[PDB]
């Protein structure tokens, strides 16, 4: 309680803001996971299937394919060091879209649109 040890961890023992944020994040991603953003988050709700979409180039592009579900799940898995891990992979999932695809692409189209929701979401997160 009230420790100045913030080198290896920014958090106290863990989460002064984080898990509150993640919890925010989830409601924020699971927000994106809402059937409203699922016009523009659903290639994100789930991972890149490189054998599916016909990628094969993928492993050139997509090192760390992120998707809503994954930053959602990691979020909920509490891999999320905090929201900045949340919005990290939300945007990384927005990235895997941009890296692979042209920025006029449907997936990237979501990403920028999810960026309307997500980042607005993200901004209403804790921090205090």
């Amino acid at each position: 309680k009230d420790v100045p040890d913030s080198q290896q961890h920014p958090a106290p023992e863990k989460s002064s803001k984080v898990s509150e944020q993640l919890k925010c994040c989830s409601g924020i991603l699971k927000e994106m996971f809402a059937k409203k953003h699922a016009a523009y988050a659903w290639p994100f709700y789930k991972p890149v299937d490189v054998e599916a979409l016909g990628l094969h180039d993928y492993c050139d592009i997509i090192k760390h394919p992120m998707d809503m579900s994954t930053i959602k799940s990691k979020l909920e898995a509490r891999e999320y060091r905090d929201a900045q891990e949340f919005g990290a992979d939300v945007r990384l999932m927005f990235s895997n879209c941009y890296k692979y695809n042209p920025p006029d692409h449907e997936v990237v189209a979501m990403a920028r649109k999810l960026q309307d929701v997500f980042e607005m979401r993200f901004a209403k997160m804790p921090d205090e």
Partner: peptide, 13 residues
């Protein structure tokens, strides 16, 4: 290689 592919979205064809 050259990025000929993209994440194919909805087989409309």
């Amino acid at each position: 290689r050259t990025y000929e592919t993209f994440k194919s979205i909805m087989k409309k064809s």
